[PDB]
């Protein structure tokens, strides 16, 4: 009966990739009824990702689509959306929640417990976004979302980061043609390009104690210095990192 | 199943809670693990106190402040790791005869679950490859056909006593208790020699135990977290300072 959380994670090949997927998987391993939809930004599925997913024992679906200034991960998230629509019928009976989780963010276990009951669309505060310690939806005493507490373009339809919301799968299946915009995308308007088609502000479900707590962090990982590898390479290229 | 005492120095800064959260999420999977968190602060912070309590992990919350003066050549977390070493020696009798292993795990590295099982059986000192250190994709101990470490595959000072990162070795607890005077060198330390300063007083190259498929696999990564941009907070602040992040 517990709704399935479909975690959509775009990823790509770069030094820290395996490390990111490892600590993310270590977090996800704690979450019951979780389906990890990993979409690689590559011409084909890589063995590094295939083996890592296989070895976790997690329930996953491994897809891939290569990106030919559109937001990072867009075509990959869109592929996941189309995959969901091709896999689950509009008015199916298998309850689900969809969450777009980038591979470098930090997620608390409480975050998933909060989003699991999503009826339409849920929202919550996200740390380290918009040049602030955290952005958060503005909720009134009645528990309704009435605005957004941000500095960067506070009046966007939905001034919230990708990691700050989840959508009941039913809405995704019903609005079969709703995808993230990649063409005319404005600064920080991609989230709105999708949400605007799915739900209205007043129907949002505020989580994290009426959006007063931070349960997810927009952490970024520093690029490793590989200067000592030289032009010829020092370490064994066949050793996976 | 020997207890793994994970020594983790930590300090207050924006990404701290997130770092401890994703590290805790990994550690929660490891059985018989004792998390020795040592805060670089004058007193135990409520943030860390609450987080540790809520994880459900077996832990000991300690603290020692690295003199402000010292932060203005002393490696980060040095006094904190030494505090843990002293705590272990004051808690476990020299001849404790109690199975245990000590591992110094910084709060920003990435750790695989397999890593802990590799180090759990350590009899003296075990070593393994570590990604993203020494300006390389990874540094790895070099082993001979006899199964002994005979050197180190590194570009930076590969001929030092122990050319290895803090995340690349673990020490048998009994050895720590036996060599009661062995601590990390506080200051003066030539860059990249801190690990050797301790290890040289604990073991010889020949007594090292190579792990991670005879040092051919990467099970731990020296990842670093970017500093969050808080420019929009302004001088007087924008967000509520009471909200814990
Ligand atoms: O060429 C690229 C760059 C990023 N990504 C992924 O898309 C998301 C975008 O995040 P990243 O650039 O961290 O985003 P930022 O934190 O810069 O907003 C992450 O899951 C990445 O792994 C991708 O698929 N292809
Ligand atoms: O004033 C400080 C700076 C760092 N640390 C901790 O000591 C270790 C040192 O790591 P950090 O500088 O990342 O080390 P680096 O990756 O630079 O080697 C980490 O566990 C930190 O949380 C600390 O206790 N106090
Ligand atoms: Mn990111
Ligand atoms: Mn570090």
From Swiss-Prot, chain A:
Glycosylation sites: 59, 91, 210
Record GO cellular component, one term: intracellular membrane-bounded organelle
Function: Involved in the biosynthesis of L2/HNK-1 carbohydrate epitope on glycoproteins. Can also play a role in glycosaminoglycan biosynthesis. Substrates include asialo-orosomucoid (ASOR), asialo-fetuin, and asialo-neural cell adhesion molecule. Requires sphingomyelin for activity: stearoyl-sphingomyelin was the most effective, followed by palmitoyl-sphingomyelin and lignoceroyl-sphingomyelin. Activity was demonstrated only for sphingomyelin with a saturated fatty acid and not for that with an unsaturated fatty acid, regardless of the length of the acyl group.
Name of the molecule in the record: Galactosylgalactosylxylosylprotein 3-beta-glucuronosyltransferase 1
Gene Ontology MF annotations: galactosylgalactosylxylosylprotein 3-beta-glucuronosyltransferase activity; metal ion binding
Alphabetic keyword roster: Endoplasmic reticulum, Glycoprotein, Golgi apparatus, Manganese, Membrane, Metal-binding, Phosphoprotein, Secreted, Signal-anchor, Transferase, Transmembrane, Transmembrane helix
Gene that encodes the chain: B3GAT1
Domain of life: Eukaryota
Cofactor dependency: Mn(2+)
Record-annotated active site: 191
Residue ranges annotated as Lumenal topological domain: 2-241
Organism: Homo sapiens (Human)
Site entry: Interaction with galactose moiety of substrate glycoprotein: 135, 228
Phosphothreonine: modified positions: 22, 27
Pathway: Protein modification; protein glycosylation
Swiss-Prot record, chain B:
Swiss-Prot/TrEMBL site (Interaction with galactose moiety of substrate glycoprotein) positions: 139, 232
Enzyme class: transferase
UniProt keyword annotations, A-Z: Endoplasmic reticulum, Glycoprotein, Golgi apparatus, Manganese, Membrane, Metal-binding, Phosphoprotein, Secreted, Signal-anchor, Transferase, Transmembrane, Transmembrane helix
PTM statement from Swiss-Prot or TrEMBL: The soluble form derives from the membrane form by proteolytic processing.
Residue positions binding Mn(2+): 108
Binding, UDP-alpha-D-glucuronate: 9-11, 40, 76, 81, 106-108, 222-224
GO CC terms of this entry: endoplasmic reticulum membrane; extracellular region; Golgi membrane; intracellular membrane-bounded organelle; membrane
Official protein name in the record: Galactosylgalactosylxylosylprotein 3-beta-glucuronosyltransferase 1
Gene name, Swiss-Prot/TrEMBL: B3GAT1
